[PDB]
Amino acid sequence: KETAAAKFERQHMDSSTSAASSSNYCNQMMKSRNLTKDRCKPVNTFVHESLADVQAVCSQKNVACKNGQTNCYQSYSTMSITDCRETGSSKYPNCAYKTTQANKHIIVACEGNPYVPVHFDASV
Numbered sequence: 001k002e003t004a005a006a007k008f009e010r011q012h013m014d015s016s017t018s019a020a021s022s023s024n025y026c027n028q029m030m031k032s033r034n035l036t037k038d039r040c041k042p043v044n045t046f047v048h049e050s051l052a053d054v055q056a057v058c059s060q061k062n063v064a065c066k067n068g069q070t071n072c073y074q075s076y077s078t079m080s081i082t083d084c085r086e087t088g089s090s091k092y093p094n095c096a097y098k099t100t101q102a103n104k105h106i107i108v109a110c111e112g113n114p115y116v117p118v119h120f121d122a123s124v
Contacts, residue, residue, distance in 0.1 A: 004119075005048070008116075008117050008119065010034070010102045011033060011044065011120070012030065012046060012047050012054075012120050013047055013054065014046045014047065014048050014071070014082070015049065015050055015051060018098045019080055022087060024099070025094075025098035026098070027099075030044060030095060030097055030109050036093065038065075039092055040086050040091075040096070041075050041095075042094035043083070043084065043085050044080040045083045045123055046081060046084065046118075047081050048081065053079075054079075055114075055116050056107065057073050057106065057110075058110035058115045058117060059098075059115075060073050061075075061076065065119075066121055066122060069086060071109050071110055071111060072108070072110075072121050073108055074105050077105070078103045078104055078105055079104065080103055081102055081123055082102075083099075083123070084098070084099060084100075102123065104124060105123070106123055108121060109121055
């Protein structure tokens with residue numbers, strides 16, 4: 001099955017754009033990346049940077065994850081990200097999202113060898 005590493009790329013990476021370009025970005029991307037297949041995923045963040053720069057976070061600032069795990073890492077630099085939150089009109093399978101653009105530090109959990117991001121923990 002899909003590796004934790006590949007799932008992170010599919011759920012969270014968008015190197016093809018610098019930023020969300022219209023209010024429909026989240027609707028289009030949640031759909032196209034297959035995140036609304038079984039249910040409307042309530043929240044999701046997309047990162048508009050090269051994969052190499054996001055992978056490098058695993059060698060940056062070690063921090064505890066929101067759940068208390070100690071394999072979390074925070075980016076030294078801010079990154080271009082898009083936050084997607086379900087709207088009050090969202091109704092499976094017509095999942096609907098509010099697109100919000102932001103520039104923040106990202107916190108990821110890392111695992112494996114190579115040591116790469118497997119979970120997006122938060123943006124700060």
